[PDB]
Amino acid sequence: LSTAILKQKNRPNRLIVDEAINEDNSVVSLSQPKMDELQLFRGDTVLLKGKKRREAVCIVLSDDTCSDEKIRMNRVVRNNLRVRLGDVISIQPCPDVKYGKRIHVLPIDDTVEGITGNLFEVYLKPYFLEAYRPIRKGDIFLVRGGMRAVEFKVVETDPSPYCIVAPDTVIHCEGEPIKREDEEESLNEVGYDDIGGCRKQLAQIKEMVELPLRHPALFKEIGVKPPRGILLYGPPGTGKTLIARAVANETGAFFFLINGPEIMSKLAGESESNLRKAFEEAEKNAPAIIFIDELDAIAPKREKTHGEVERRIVSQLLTLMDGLKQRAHVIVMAATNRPNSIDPALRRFGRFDREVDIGIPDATGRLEILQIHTKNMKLADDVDLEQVANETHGHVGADLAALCSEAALQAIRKKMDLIDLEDETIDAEVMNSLAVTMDDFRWALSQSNPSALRETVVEVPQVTWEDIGGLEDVKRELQELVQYPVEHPDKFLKFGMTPSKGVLFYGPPGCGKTLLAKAIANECQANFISIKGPELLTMWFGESEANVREIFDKARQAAPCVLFFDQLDSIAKARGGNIGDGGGAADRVINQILTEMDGMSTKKNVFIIGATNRPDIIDPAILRPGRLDQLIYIPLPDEKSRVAILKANLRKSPVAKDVDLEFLAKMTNGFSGADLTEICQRACKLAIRESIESEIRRERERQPVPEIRRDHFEEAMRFARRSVSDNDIRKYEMFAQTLQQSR
């Protein structure tokens, strides 16, 4: 019953939008049985409610072709109601509708152009002659005729707003024509249906802001005081301001908007006076809603504040929100993406006591957001918004809008060959062919990245699983450890075992740890955050802990996310080993890291991968159960793994057939992957030297080397060296033995 207020009950007034076969602007048709169920007569005036607080008036008609559950409308009254096909609207008998004494109309500016004669005489007068048409203020209606059919807006009605246009009624088009852009903006108005992925949040908001203002008697009688302070908090782009616009458009209560920094004024005492004026004007027009966007701009913690005017403003806000109880129906809703920066006293009982977390949407929520954003675009048939919803692992809704915009921009780019930018006009066929396809959405997904991971983004080489040679068990284990927790958490819950959320890679240098991280970044469908070791450390006291907090928080915001710690031993070194030497900031850093590893719930899919070639100096606490549980030894490759590495490196290279990779694997017993890569690079450089010298010789004689050969590899092998010694290997062997003994 959490989202019961969202779903609309089946009512006799509730009817599905249907196309009207022959109804004009001022009439609608309903099925006769449903009409009798509604107790309505033919020729009766009817009031149609619509989305975004828009209503229309028509005449009910009986049509057998019309469905019982459907009400038939033409497109004009659909635009008057801001509704479309498939929508549900409520129809009621409009009582005591009177013949209009006088009605003033304003035609649209585009339609009047090219019409030499009078708009009234040619269009309005024959339209309303003996028509007895019901009209409402603000409605837009189209009259056919002349060179071009002309649209009109009924700006003024008498009596207002409902009136019947009798012949004696005077309709006149004098005045300023209404811009088409104004009508477009009015129709394209943000409503509750423009919000996706926040069904529970919308439920809470409707329960807190719309229900008390519509029906305060219920809250009075049940015995409770309706909530007064509501605070929307969440990551940037999640839709707090969107929710505020939807509420402002779809609420009958007076809406007052306070932009935070706009409170300040140069005159002494004018800022808190502006706050007072806002609350007083809300009280004058009650029921009222006061929206404060960027609440942290004017409401920081008073203890941290070094300005007297800012502290006085926080105190004024506290006083006004306390006195809000005396105010009859004023409700204060605030939005901020830094809820922790808000003054704590403002979050107490009686003031901003309700908090709504506009979080990151899930797959279905992202699908709803994509459906909302793509409703106006001209999608092709091949598009599949479900796939796009599944790909965008860390998108919040602004990112999805960016994705749709980029897909449409790619669609427009595909026609830049046919249309030049310097061209003055475009053929209509080019517009007719223009459409967004699934390839454009796939290009957008390739370019798309979460907005949160815009500072941690790094250029990663295109490493693929087939680029890595050997390590097949490690590859399979990593693929499972990434896919299983996100895809099937229900099995882990059923068996009662939480998936491992921490992996450490340890091994000799050059054996494939960072390469595995690159492959994970390129291949897995999870957001990847790669940070260098000492990237977080800062000289200013308290900043390194804040950096750890920020990186872990933006890892959570992009879940499922992989947080890779290259050279972990810089980030996490043994506590007490260097405690005496230094200020002690590294110990605070590692303690903060431990706190963040412990703080994660299993529901957030933030996989933490650490890489180090010195596991012996890793802090013992980091490896304890619950944090970096899975410890993986990336070893020195063996003969089959060396064959795989040599094939993977030479996969894109022209290599002679007689070049035997098996013997190279045999002879390079102690070599690592980096050593084999160095051998191949040295052979490539020898081939390049031979080709360059051959070209120089040919130029000299005037005034080759199709592929790498066996002699090139033979020459490169004598320069080859084993990078990792036996003692180094023994070090990881002792680490593994001690770790097994501990476990």
Minimum separation from the CB atom of position 275 to a second copy (A): 17
**Binding residue (CB under 6 A) for ligand ATP from 100, 134, 469, 502:** 469
Q: Is 260 in contact with 357 (CB distance < 8 Å)?
A: no
Strand 527-531, strand 288-293: pairing: unpaired
**Binding residue (CB under 6 A) for ligand ATP from 499, 673, 686, 712:** 673
Residue 352 region, left (φ>0) first, then alpha (ψ -120 to 50), else beta?
left
Within positions 289 to 318, which residues make up the interface with a second copy, using CB under 8 A?
A: 294, 297, 300, 302-311, 315
Minimum separation from the CB atom of position 315 to a second copy (A): 7
If DSSP codes are grouped into helix, strand and coil, which group holds residue 211?
Answer: helix
**How many residues bind a second copy, per CB under 8 A?**
15
305 binds, among ligand ATP, a second copy, Mg ion, none (CB under 5 to 8 A by kind): a second copy
| Residues 6 or more apart in contact with residue 73 via CB below 8 angstroms | 17, 18, 19, 20, 23, 28, 48, 58, 81
Taking the C-alpha atoms of residue 489 and residue 603, their distance in angstroms, rounded to an integer, is 8
x/- letters, 585..614, toward ligand ATP (CB under 6 A): --------------------------x-x-
Within positions 164 to 223, which residues make up the interface with ligand ATP, using CB under 6 A?
A: 195-198
Taking the C-alpha atoms of residue 133 and residue 153, their distance in angstroms, rounded to an integer, is 15
Of 35-43, 211-219, 346-354, 670-678: span binding ligand ATP (CB under 6 A): 670-678
> How big is the chain by its Cα radius of gyration, in Å?
35
Of 71-79, 118-126, 339-347, 505-513: span binding ligand ATP (CB under 6 A): 505-513
Q: Is 520 in contact with 513 (CB distance < 8 Å)?
A: no
Taking the C-alpha atoms of residue 661 and residue 641, their distance in angstroms, rounded to an integer, is 12
- Would you say 515 is a known binding-site residue? yes
- Would you say 117 is a known binding-site residue? no
Q: Which is nearer to ligand ATP, 15 or 242 (CB)?
A: 242
Q: Which is nearer to Mg ion, 237 or 499 (CB)?
A: 237
**Binding residue (CB under 6 A) for ligand ATP from 257, 401, 445, 736:** 401
Structure tokens at 578: 């260097």
- Would you say 339 is a known binding-site residue? no
Gaps in the chain (C to N distance exceeding 2.5 A) after: 703
Q: Does 394 engage in binding with ligand ATP (CB under 6 A)? A: no
Q: Render 413-425 in DSSP notation, one character per residue.
A: HTTTTTS-TT-S-
167 binds, among ligand ATP, Mg ion, a second copy, none (CB under 5 to 8 A by kind): none
x/- letters, 227..266, toward ligand ATP (CB under 6 A): ---------xxxxxxx------------------------
Q: Which is nearer to a second copy, 300 or 560 (CB)?
A: 300
| Residue whose C-alpha is closest to residue 251's, from 219, 218, 205 | 205
- Would you say 237 is a known binding-site residue? yes
Q: Rounding to the nearest 10 degrees, give the CA dihedral for residues 164, 169, 170, 176.
A: -10
92 binds, among ligand ATP, Mg ion, a second copy, none (CB under 5 to 8 A by kind): none
Q: Is 369 in contact with 397 (CB distance < 8 Å)?
A: yes
Within positions 335 to 364, which residues make up the interface with a second copy, using CB under 8 A?
A: 345
Helix (H) / strand (E) element for 103: namely strand 102-107
Q: Which is nearer to Mg ion, 241 or 273 (CB)?
A: 241
Q: Is 154 in contact with 124 (CB distance < 8 Å)?
A: no
- Would you say 238 is a known binding-site residue? yes
237 binds, among ligand ATP, a second copy, Mg ion, none (CB under 5 to 8 A by kind): ligand ATP
Q: Which is nearer to ligand ATP, 451 or 591 (CB)?
A: 451
Q: Does 514 engage in binding with ligand ATP (CB under 6 A)? A: yes
Helix (H) / strand (E) element for 494: namely helix 489-495
If DSSP codes are grouped into helix, strand and coil, which group holds residue 332?
Answer: strand
- What is the number of residues in the chain? 743
- Would you say 252 is a known binding-site residue? no
Q: Does 122 engage in binding with ligand ATP (CB under 6 A)? A: no
Q: Which is nearer to ligand ATP, 526 or 645 (CB)?
A: 645
300 binds, among a second copy, ligand ATP, Mg ion, none (CB under 5 to 8 A by kind): a second copy
| Residue whose C-alpha is closest to residue 600's, from 580, 619, 628 | 628
Q: Which is nearer to a second copy, 300 or 610 (CB)?
A: 300
Taking CA atoms, 237 is separated from 69, 140, 205, 259, 396, in Å, by 39, 34, 18, 17, 6
CB-count exposure of residue 603 (10 Å: 0-12, 13-18, 19+): exposed
> Which residues are annotated binding-site positions?
236-242, 337, 373, 510-515
Q: Which residues bind a second copy (CB under 8 A)?
A: 294, 297, 300, 302-311, 315, 345
Instruction: Please give the annotated binding residues for ATP, written as ranges.
Output: 236-242, 337, 373, 510-515
In the complex, the residues that contact ligand ATP under the rule CB under 6 A are 195-198, 236-242, 335, 337, 369, 372, 397-398, 401, 468-471, 509-515, 611, 613, 645, 648-649, 673-674, 677
